[PDB]
Design a binder for this molecule. Structure first.
Ligand SMILES: [Ca+2]
Ligand SMILES: [Ca+2]
Length: 269
């Protein structure tokens, strides 16, 4: 029995799936704590940039969780991703403890840019800016990667790095009411929002678990981008990012919500 988590249908991925759009041929890199082998996931490759954890398997559960929001397989078990046919690559830039260095994160993006990744998912952040990080962001961007990052969970009216950088697509979190979740950082650089409360997904030990955060919202956007990329194979990172924003559902102030809630139905139209 397969269930469709609420944010998947909130963003209207099924509407897109019903038109032949599943993210097929789109390469998506998850820069996180790894992705564990799971019966509802198809991991195509990856690398680890965490000294001391040479494997890409997830010792934390955070990346496995994020990954399933993007691409949990559409079959008869578990859950369902926004882009269930996306090619998923596990890029480990965060250790088991759930933290990493800017160095490891910048190496992951470098890797993404060098390996022709179309979308990079960075459900991570820091309140502090990093010149290293920023350059990596910009580099992956000129290599044609769309970088999608979490705004953070401090609840403050200013967003984290790298989401704050012009070249990153900053994602905030909404609740089932289509209100901004209290922890969701907002303000300048915020581009769009997505479901980030009680998000059910894939978890290590072949199970499913629900989490809260902008980390959970980000992957709905990364997925949404793969759907559009499949529909418009000639579009660049910028064209996708703008189409997403242009087709989002307004939810109120752009200070709080940026463009509004991502809408994969409106976007693959
Ligand atoms: Ca499934
Ligand atoms: Ca931004």
């Amino acid at each position: 029995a397969q269930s469709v988590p609420w944010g998947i249908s909130r963003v209207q991925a099924p509407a897109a799936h019903n038109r032949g759009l599943t993210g097929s041929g789109v390469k998506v890199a998850v820069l996180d704590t790894g992705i564990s082998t799971h019966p509802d996931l198809n991991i195509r490759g990856g690398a680890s940039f965490v000294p001391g954890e040479p494997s890409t398997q997830d010792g934390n559960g955070h990346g496995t969780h994020v990954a399933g929001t993007i691409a949990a397989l559409n079959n008869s078990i578990g859950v369902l991703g926004v882009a269930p046919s996306a090619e998923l690559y596990a890029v480990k830039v965060l250790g088991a403890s759930g933290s990493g260095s800017v160095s490891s994160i910048a190496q992951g993006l470098e890797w993404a840019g060098n390996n022709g990744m179309h979308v990079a998912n960075l459900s991570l952040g820091s309140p502090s800016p990093s010149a290293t990080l920023e350059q990596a962001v910009n580099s992956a961007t000129s290599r044609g990667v769309l970088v999608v990052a979490a705004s953070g969970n401090s609840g403050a009216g200013s967003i984290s790095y790298p989401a704050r950088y012009a070249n990153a697509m900053a994602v905030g979190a909404t609740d089932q009411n289509n209100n901004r979740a209290s922890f969701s950082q907002y303000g300048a650089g915020l581009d769009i929002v997505a479901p980030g409360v009680n998000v059910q997904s894939t978890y290590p030990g072949s199970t499913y678990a629900s989490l809260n955060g902008t980390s959970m919202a980000t992957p709905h956007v990364a997925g949404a981008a793969a759907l559009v990329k499949q529909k418009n194979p000639s579009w660049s990172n910028v064209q996708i990012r703008n189409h997403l924003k242009n087709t989002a559902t307004s939810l109120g102030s752009t200070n709080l919500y940026g463009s509004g809630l991502v809408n994969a139905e409106a976007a693959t139209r």
